[PDB]
Design a protein around this ligand. Structure first.
Ligand code: NGA
Length: 514
C-alpha cells in the first residue's frame, strides 16, 4: 500500500482525552487550575490540556464523500518538503504537528520535514528538541541566527528543501486524513497552481477540531485592503465541474499552502523588501495571479490550526507594486496608508516586467469580477462640508456590528476620511464606502438619512437612494422631494435632516473637499 505513512498512528482509543478531535474538558482541583491558567497566560493556548492529549490522536474525517473515494497514482505524484517555522512553541503542540505530518502523509511523497527554529529562547528547543527529532526519520532542524519572522524563516527553510513541492504548514497544526494527495495531485497537473488546504479551527482551550463542512469560503479583500472572506461566486461554481474540484481564491486565506519549489523560486518566493512582519500574502496573491499562476483552495485537503487566545507598510507595498491605477481607491479609503514607508520597489517593478505579469485591471476582471470598483470621480469624493455650519462635515458613525444602525449626522471636519468619506456616483448614489458598499437612503415618508447595502453592479438603483448634487451646492433627494439641511438640535448639537428645499438657505448648501 503506497499510501502507507512513515509511522502509523496507534489504534484509536475512544476513552482517551480528545480522541477524534472532540472537545476536551478536565476535572481539576484548585492547584491544577492554577497550573492550567499559568500556561494559558504564557502560551495563549491550553498547554496543560495539550500535554494530556495524545501527540498521535486521530481526527475524525468529515469531508465531502467524494473526497474519501478518490484514487491516486502514488508512483507519479510529486514529492514534498514540509516546512514548519516556530518561535517559542510549546513542546506538545510542536510535536503533535510533527507526528501528525509523519502519520498522515504517504512515505513515498514525504521527502522531509524541515523545522525552522526562528531564534527560540525556550531551553527545551535547544538540546532536547534535537535529541527528540534524532529518532524521527526525515525530520530535520534548521536554525536562524536572528529573529527572522514567519516569512523569512520559511524562506530559509525552503532554501534547504529539495522536494518537488514546498508545503508550508505551521507549528500547531493537525492534519486530516488524505490532506496531502489533493494538493500534490493538482500541482502535478498544473505546476503554476498554488494550492491551499481548507484551514479548520482547533480550539485553543478545548482542543476540539471544528471541520468546515462542504463548501469553504474563499479569500479576498475590501478597498482598505483588509482581508475579507467571501462566498464562492456563480462564475466559479459554473466553471468548476465537481464540487470537490479546487476553488480559485482571489487572495490567500491563511498561511498554509503548497507550491512547486521551482515555480516558487521563479516567482521570486516572497517579497524580501518587506521590512515589517505580517500581511505578506496579499503581495504574494497579486503576484501569483497577475504573473499567472492560479491560487486555489482544495476542499478535500483539511488542516486544523490552533488559533491562539500593524502591517500597513506591507499592504501599501502590495498596492504600489501591483495595483496600477486602482491604488488610489485604496488610499482614499485607508488614508493612514499614504504615510507608510513601503520601501524601495525598484527591483519588484523589474521582476514584474521580467515575468510579463498582466495588469491589475486584468486581475479585477478575470480573478475578482464581483468586487465593486469605486469610481472616485474628480470633485465628487471626499468629505462633504456644510456651508451653514462651516466647521461640520457629513458623518456616519454606526456600531461595529450593525453597519447600517445609525442615521447620517454632522461632526467636526477632521480631514481623515473614514466616517467622513463619501463618494457621489455616476448612478447618483451617495456611497459611504470606505468599509463596504453602503448607499445613503431616505426611508419612505421620512425626513432622516440612513444607510443600506448598495445594489449589485448592473441592477436597479432604488428611487429612494438617488441624490442630485445641484450646481448651487444643494443636495436634492428627488423621491422625497426634499433637500439635505444642516440644523442644530434644541440642545445645540449639529445634525442633518431632510427639509423643504430653499436654495437661499445656507444650511442646504454643501461642498466636496479632498
Ligand atoms: C476619522 C473618523 O472616522 N473619525 C470619526 C469621526 O468622523 C466621528 O464619527 C467620531 C464619532 O465618535 O468618531 C471619529 O473619530
Amino acid at each position: 500500500d503506497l499510501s502507507r505513512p512513515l509511522y502509523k498512528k496507534p489504534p484509536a482509543d475512544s476513552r482517551a482525552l480528545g480522541e477524534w478531535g472532540k472537545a476536551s474538558k478536565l476535572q481539576l482541583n484548585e492547584d491544577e487550575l492554577k497550573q492550567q491558567e499559568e500556561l494559558i497566560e504564557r502560551y495563549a493556548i491550553n498547554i496543560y490540556l495539550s500535554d494530556r492529549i495524545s501527540l498521535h490522536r486521530h481526527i475524525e474525517d468529515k469531508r465531502m464523500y467524494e473526497c474519501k473515494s478518490q484514487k491516486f497514482n502514488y508512483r507519479t505524484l510529486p514529492t514534498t518538503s514540509v516546512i514548519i517555522a516556530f518561535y517559542n512553541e510549546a513542546w506538545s503542540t510542536l510535536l503533535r504537528t510533527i507526528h501528525s505530518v509523519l502519520e498522515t502523509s504517504p512515505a513515498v511523497l514525504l521527502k522531509e520535514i524541515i523545522l525552522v527554529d526562528d531564534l527560540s529562547d525556550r531551553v527545551y528547543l535547544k538540546t532536547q528538541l534535537e535529541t527528540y527529532i534524532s529518532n524521527l526519520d526525515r525530520v530535520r532542524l534548521i536554525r536562524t541566527n536572528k529573529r527572522e519572522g514567519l516569512v523569512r524563516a520559511r524562506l530559509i527553510g525552503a532554501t534547504f528543501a529539495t522536494g518537488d513541492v514546498l508545503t508550508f504548514l505551521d507549528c500547531h497544526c493537525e492534519c486530516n486524513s488524505g490532506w496531502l494527495e489533493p494538493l500534490l495531485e493538482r500541482i502535478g497537473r498544473d505546476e503554476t497552481a498554488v494550492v491551499c488546504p481548507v484551514i479548520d479551527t482547533i480550539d485553543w482551550n478545548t482542543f476540539e477540531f471544528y471541520m468546515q463542512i462542504g463548501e469553504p469560503m474563499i479569500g479576498g479583500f475590501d478597498w482598505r485592503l483588509t482581508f475579507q472572506w467571501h462566498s464562492v461566486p456563480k462564475q466559479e461554481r459554473d466553471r468548476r465541474i465537481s464540487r470537490i474540484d479546487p476553488i480559485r481564491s482571489p487572495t490567500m486565506a491563511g498561511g498554509l499552502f503548497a507550491v512547486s519549489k521551482k515555480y516558487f523560486q521563479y516567482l521570486g518566493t516572497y517579497d524580501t523588501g518587506m521590512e515589517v512582519w505580517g500581511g505578506e500574502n496579499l503581495e504574494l496573491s497579486f503576484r501569483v495571479w497577475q504573473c499567472g499562476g492560479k491560487l486555489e483552495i482544495h476542499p478535500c485537503s483539511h488542516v486544523g490550526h490552533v488559533f491562539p487566545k500593524n502591517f500597513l507598510q506591507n499592504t501599501a507595498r502590495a498596492a504600489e507594486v501591483w495595483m496600477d491605477e486602482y491604488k488610489e481607491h485604496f488610499y482614499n479609503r485607508n488614508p493612514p496608508a499614504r504615510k507608510e514607508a513601503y520601501g524601495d520597489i525598484s527591483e519588484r517593478k523589474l521582476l514584474r516586467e521580467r515575468l510579463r505579469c498582466k495588469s491589475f485591471d486584468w486581475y479585477l476582471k478575470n480573478v475578482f469580477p464581483n468586487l465593486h470598483v469605486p469610481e472616485d470621480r474628480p470633485g465628487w469624493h471626499g468629505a462633504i462640508r456644510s456651508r451653514g455650519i462651516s466647521s461640520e462635515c457629513l458623518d456616519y458613525n454606526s456600531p461595529d456590528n450593525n453597519p447600517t444602525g445609525a442615521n447620517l449626522s454632522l461632526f467636526g471636519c477632521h480631514g481623515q476620511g473614514g466616517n467622513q468619506f463619501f463618494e457621489y456616483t455616476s448612478n447618483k448614489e451617495i456611497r459611504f464606502n470606505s468599509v463596504t458598499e453602503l448607499c445613503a437612503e431616505v426611508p419612505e415618508q421620512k425626513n432622516y438619512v440612513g444607510m443600506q447595502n448598495c445594489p449589485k453592479d448592473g441592477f436597479p438603483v432604488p428611487a429612494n437612494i438617488i441624490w442630485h448634487f445641484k450646481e448651487d451646492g444643494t443636495i436634492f433627494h428627488p423621491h422625497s422631494g426634499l433637500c439635505l439641511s444642516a440644523y442644530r438640535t434644541p440642545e445645540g448639537r449639529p445634525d442633518v435632516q431632510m427639509r423643504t428645499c430653499d436654495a437661499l438657505d445656507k444650511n442646504q448648501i454643501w461642498s466636496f473637499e479632498k
